[PDB]
Amino acid sequence: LQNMETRYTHSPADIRHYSTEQLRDEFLVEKVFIPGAISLTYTHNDRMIFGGVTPTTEELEIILDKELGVDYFLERRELGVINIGGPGFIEIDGAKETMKKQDGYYIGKETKHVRFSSENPDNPAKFYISCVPAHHKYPNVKISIDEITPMETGDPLTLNQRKIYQYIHPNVCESCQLQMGYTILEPGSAWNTRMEAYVYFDMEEDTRIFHMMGKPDETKHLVMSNEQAAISPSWSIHSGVGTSNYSFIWAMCGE
Numbered sequence: 001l002q003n004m005e006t007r008y009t010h011s012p013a014d015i016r017h018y019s020t021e022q023l024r025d026e027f028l029v030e031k032v033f034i035p036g037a038i039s040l041t042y043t044h045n046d047r048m049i050f051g052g053v054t055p056t057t058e059e060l061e062i063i064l065d066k067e068l069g070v071d072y073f074l075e076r077r078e079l080g081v082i083n084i085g086g087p088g089f090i091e092i093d094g095a096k097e098t099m100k101k102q103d104g105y106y107i108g109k110e111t112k113h114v115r116f117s118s119e120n121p122d123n124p125a126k127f128y129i130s131c132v133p134a135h136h137k138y139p140n141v142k143i144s145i146d147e148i149t150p151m152e153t154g155d156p157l158t159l160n161q162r163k164i165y166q167y168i169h170p171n172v173c174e175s176c177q178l179q180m181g182y183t184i185l186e187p188g189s190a191w192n193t194r195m196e197a198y199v200y201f202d203m204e205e206d207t208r209i210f211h212m213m214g215k216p217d218e219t220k221h222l223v224m225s226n227e228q229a230a231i232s233p234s235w236s237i238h239s240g241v242g243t244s245n246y247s248f249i250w251a252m253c254g255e
Contacts, residue, residue, distance in 0.1 A: 002062065004040035004049060009233050012215040027213060028222045029229040032199055033085070033126045038062055040129075045195040045233045046253050049077075049131045052199075052227075054085065056124045059117035062131075074111050078134035080168040080180040081105045081127055082143075082249055084201050088125025091115040092140055099125060102182065104143035104167040106175060109134040126227075128199055130168075130251030134176040141173040145182075148172065154189065161189040168251075177253040190242035194254025198238070199229040200246050207244035212237050 007026060015023070024030075029041050033052035038060050040051035053060050064073045081090065082104040090099045092107055092114050099105070099116075107114055118125040145165065154160030166172060168180035184202070185191075190209075200209050203226045211222045211230045219237055222230055226246075232238050234254070 002038040002040070002060070004042050004051070004064070004067070006042040007044065007231065009043065009045045012218060012235055015214065015220075016218065018220070023220055023222055027231045028224065029231070032128070032227050032229050035124055041229075041231075043197065043231050045231060047133055048195070048197060048251065048253055050129060050197050050199075050229065050251060052126055052128050053116050054124050054126045055088065055116045055118045056121040059091070059115045061113060061115045062129070072112055074107065074109060074114070074131075076109060076133060076135070077131050078109055078138070078175055078178050079107045079114070079129055079131040080178050080251060081107070081129050082167060082180065082182060083125050084128050084249070085126030086118060086120055086123035088116060088118040088127065091117070097142060099127070102145040104180070106138070106141045106143065106168050106173045108140055109137040109176075111140060128249050130178060130180055130197065132176070132178045132253040134178075136176055138174040138176070143167050143172055154191070156186070156188050158191070159189045160191040160193070161186040179252045181250050182247065183250065184247040185242065185245050187245050190244060190246070192239040194252055195234045196232045196238055196250055196252040197229060198232065198240070198248055198250050199227070200224055200248045201227045203242065203246035204244055207242055207246060209240050209242040209246060211240040
């Protein structure tokens with residue numbers, strides 16, 4: 001099955017007295033990669049639809065049209081993808097390529113069918129997709145960790161020794177507004193310091209991250225587990241501290 005939960009946005013005031021529960025209910029996505037299905041969430045923050053399509057025993061395709069007042073999913077949207085799990089395949093309008101972990105892809109407006117598949121149901125490919133409205137059509141371009149020069153910064157003295165990877169960025173491809181990145185916190189570090197959406201993964205079962213959010217003067221946090229995502233509205237902070245090491249994919253769009 002496939003599924004897309006929509007989430008309205010709020011104002012720093014609406015959230016001012018939110019309970020830990022409420023916060024989680026509005027800004028935390030607990031299940032991103034549920035095997036055999038596509039799990040998506042539509043945020044009214046710039047209308048980004050993100051989530052995870054993790055195929056196992058049957059190739060998957062995000063089929064959306066009436067829900068978005070269009071004939072097919074990408075008629076008026078661009079989409080970024082990065083495989084977080086096992087080796088798989090991506091079939092964009094017939095052309096079937098290989099998607100190994102860390103392999104990404106920028107697909108543009110008007111591509112009819114994008115189908116995802118894994119080469120092993122036991123170790124499925126976890127495709128994290130970030131879809132956003134697009135008015136212009138740019139060429140589809142495959143992205144491989146290789147071709148990317150990870151712009152590292154931070155220092156283990158400030159527990160932020162990390163490597164950032166620009167996937168959907170001007171240095172590797174064109175796009176209307178989507179922007180994606182892959183960041184891996186080097187061991188012994190655990191920090192992260194127009195709307196954004198974060199997905200944390202590749203972390204020990206017991207490590208958890210304290211994702212900070214809200215207006216800088218009224219910050220609150222979401223306690224997150226492995227493979228969970230957080231929606232961060234324009235007016236909110238984007239940093240987070242982990243109990244240990246972790247990686248995360250950030251997707252954004254705006255102006």
